[PDB]
């Protein structure tokens, strides 16, 4: 998902000018469509948090004894040492990726250290909508099919999950890449090690190699950029005497200040056309990247996938999700 | 069957009462007739002008001091449509992905049966069965779920002679007393026997072997007709 | 009387897997699911 932003479109153009306003509805219905689109892009920035991650039926738990054939998930199983039962792995993402957008900025800062981008763009028409699912809700889900998984096994995605031994589940998912069970039931110790041992490297690798993890920065940095850039466009002349509207309508009589505020009108009208046209893009090529993510949560995490590269090199096992400031991590546990 | 056939006939009901789907569709149409009504009103607009007819323009003004109202108007129904089609091209990018996504399922759920999951329904996909909506598809998905679960103790493997018996394509499960071999999917018990097993190594490696006798068929089928070519020697040597 | 109510998302019911350490489900018994997915062409 991205950031939900909506556009007071009279207050960004016009604001708080009745003149300038008046001048601006005979443009027509512009500022209707530009809300349209924005309020379509918001549902369905909420329509993939959902799709990407209300997958299971229940809340599955795990029991309270975390021994699963001598495989370690204690640093992808909830911490209940926080107020968000966040995982140590998920900690670690939303720690890394910072975002720049709601919270509770109506009490902006009273002119500290001048303002924040974020202030000022609160103070002309641009906000920011909160998403609906809060993180402790999508760690929620995280954490339910993560259970379900090392719990059930793929039995959870296609009806009532059914326990099963994590070791005879492993012996099973051997068997659907073509190795006999006896391979794994008599090499289970080595093969607990060799996954601790990977997913212990997972912490270090995440977050120094670099490679992916950029995408959700890019994310936040593409919209931050967009939102910039529209608040910045509000100092423009467009070819007026002041890109102040205050002070063309103090300085000019209005049929000659009329074509100053036409002026400031057609420009700013252009940069919100432009910013919606670029949020429409931007959302369809999110909203790809989240039925993909869905796609991957349902046959690489809820089953066993035989698509070759689609849940990792190798030859699939399992793969566990972990919730990142507007994304998911796939941990991919294959055979090589 | 019968299953199958109270299914599709819910359907019938399921397809308008509960809402959920069926709503994409009808989105798309108001879709484009909501672009539409907008172009079309977007006509009524002056943009500056001193009027949105373009024929009181040119009938009250001169040809030099129309011209400024006549741009005013073009540019700004230009930058109507230009809007329009921007919308209609982003929207057809949405739509095309969506067929794209309909194509795939008609050839991996109708075509074929997928192992893809949830890909093609929720559970085991067996079938699928398309249907043609306005502007759309529908796709009836025919898939099994296991339903009456119990559990029983289960074991990795069995330990009969220093062997590991470990079986071919089920599960080892256990009522409380005696030791069966079943299906993963559906509790079909079976006695564990040779046949339902293969061997490897001995019960030195396995962790959760459990004692309990393999069965062997051939054995037991050589000790019966050996029994029984007994009795006919006695039959008339003794 | 009827009136405006707001709360907090219900993700679903809590259902602890019975997880066991020998243990196993199996199903007995199945269904027949007939669903339905409509898509846009
Ligand atoms: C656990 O099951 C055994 C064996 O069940 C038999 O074999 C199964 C594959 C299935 O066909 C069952 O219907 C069979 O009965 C039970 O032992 C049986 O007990 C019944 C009732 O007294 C008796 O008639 C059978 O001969 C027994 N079978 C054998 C092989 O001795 C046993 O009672 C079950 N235990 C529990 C707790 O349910
Ligand atoms: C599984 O069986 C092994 C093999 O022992 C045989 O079966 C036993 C039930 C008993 O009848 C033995 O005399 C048989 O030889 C068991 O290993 C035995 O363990 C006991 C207890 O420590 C020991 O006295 C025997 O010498 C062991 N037998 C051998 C051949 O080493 C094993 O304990 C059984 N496992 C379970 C879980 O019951
Ligand atoms: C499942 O069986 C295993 C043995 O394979 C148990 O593991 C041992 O559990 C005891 C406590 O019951 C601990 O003292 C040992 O240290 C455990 N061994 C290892 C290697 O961790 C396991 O506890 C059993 N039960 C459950 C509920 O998981
Ligand atoms: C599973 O992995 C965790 C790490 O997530 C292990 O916890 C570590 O334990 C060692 C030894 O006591 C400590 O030095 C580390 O600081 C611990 N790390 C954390 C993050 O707490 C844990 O021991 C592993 N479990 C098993 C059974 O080996
Ligand atoms: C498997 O479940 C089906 C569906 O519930 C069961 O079929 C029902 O059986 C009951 C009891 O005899 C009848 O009243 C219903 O009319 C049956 N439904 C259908 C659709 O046929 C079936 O009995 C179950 N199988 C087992 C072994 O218990
Ligand atoms: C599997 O066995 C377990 C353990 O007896 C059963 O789970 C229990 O279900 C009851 C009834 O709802 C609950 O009160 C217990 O808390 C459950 N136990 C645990 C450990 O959570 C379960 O019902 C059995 N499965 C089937 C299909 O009968």
Not at chain 2, 92 to 120: H, P, W, Y
């Amino acid at each position: 998902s991205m950031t939900k932003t909506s556009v007071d479109c009279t207050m960004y153009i016009c604001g708080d000018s009745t003149e300038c306003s008046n001048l601006l509805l005979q443009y027509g219905s512009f500022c209707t469509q530009l809300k349209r689109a924005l309020t379509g892009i918001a549902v369905e920035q909420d329509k993939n948090t959902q799709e990407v991650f209300a997958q299971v039926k229940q809340i599955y738990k795990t029991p309270p004894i975390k021994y699963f054939g001598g495989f370690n998930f204690s640093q992808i199983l909830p911490d209940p040492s926080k107020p968000s039962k966040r995982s140590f792995i998920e900690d670690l993402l939303f720690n890394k990726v910072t975002l720049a957008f709601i919270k509770q900025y109506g009490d902006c800062l009273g002119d500290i250290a001048a303002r924040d981008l974020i202030c000022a763009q609160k103070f002309n028409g641009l906000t920011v909508l909160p998403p609906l699912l809060t993180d402790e809700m999508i760690a929620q889900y995280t954490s339910a099919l993560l259970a379900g998984t090392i719990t059930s096994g793929w039995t959870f995605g296609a009806g009532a999950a059914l326990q099963i031994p994590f070791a005879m589940q492993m012996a099973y998912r051997f068997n659907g890449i073509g190795v006999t069970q006896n391979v794994l039931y008599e090499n289970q110790k080595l093969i607990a090690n060799q996954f601790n041992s990977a997913i212990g490297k997972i912490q270090d690798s995440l977050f120094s190699t670099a490679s992916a993890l950029g995408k959700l920065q890019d994310v936040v940095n593409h919209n931050a950029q967009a939102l910039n850039t529209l608040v910045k466009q509000l100092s423009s002349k467009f070819g007026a005497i002041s890109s102040v509207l205050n002070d063309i309508l103090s300085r000019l009589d209005p049929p000659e200040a009329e074509v100053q505020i036409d002026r400031l009108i057609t420009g700013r009208l252009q940069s919100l056309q432009t910013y919606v046209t670029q949020q429409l893009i931007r959302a369809a090529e999110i909203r790809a990247s989240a039925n993909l993510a869905a796609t991957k949560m349902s046959e690489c995490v809820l089953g066993q996938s035989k698509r070759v590269d689609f849940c990792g090199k190798g030859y699939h096992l399992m793969s566990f999700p972990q919730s990142a400031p507007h994304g998911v991590v796939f941990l991919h546990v294959t055979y090589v | 069957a019968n299953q199958f056939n109270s299914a599709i006939g819910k359907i019938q009901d399921s397809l308008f009462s509960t809402a959920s789907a069926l709503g994409k569709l009808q989105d798309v149409v108001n879709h484009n007739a909501q672009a539409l009504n907008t172009l079309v009103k977007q006509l009524s607009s002056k943009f500056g002008a001193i009027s949105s007819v373009l024929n009181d323009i040119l009938s009250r003004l001169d040809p030099p001091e129309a011209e400024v109202q006549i741009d005013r108007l073009i540019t700004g129904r230009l930058q109507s449509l230009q809007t329009y089609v921007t919308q209609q091209l982003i929207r057809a990018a949405e739509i095309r992905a969506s067929a794209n996504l309909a194509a795939t399922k008609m050839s991996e759920c109708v075509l074929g049966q997928s192992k893809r999951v949830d890909f093609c329904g929720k559970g085991y996909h067996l079938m699928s069965f398309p249907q043609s909506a306005p502007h759309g598809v529908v796709f009836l998905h025919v898939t099994y779920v296991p339903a009456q679960e119990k559990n029983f103790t289960t074991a990795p493997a069995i330990c009969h002679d220093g062997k590991a018996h470990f079986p071919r394509e089920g599960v080892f499960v256990s009522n409380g007393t005696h030791w069966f071999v079943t299906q993963r999917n559906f509790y079909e018990p079976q006695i564990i026997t040779t046949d339902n097993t293969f061997v490897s190594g001995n019960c030195d490696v396995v962790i959760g072997i459990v004692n309990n006798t393999v069965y062997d068929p051939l054995q037991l089928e050589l000790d019966s007709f050996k029994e029984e070519l007994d009795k006919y020697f006695k039959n008339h040597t003794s | 009387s009827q009136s405006i109510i707001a709360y907090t998302m219900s993700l679903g019911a809590e259902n602890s897997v019975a997880y066991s350490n020998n243990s196993i489900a199996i199903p007995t018994n199945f269904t027949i699911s007939v669903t339905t997915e409509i898509l846009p062409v």
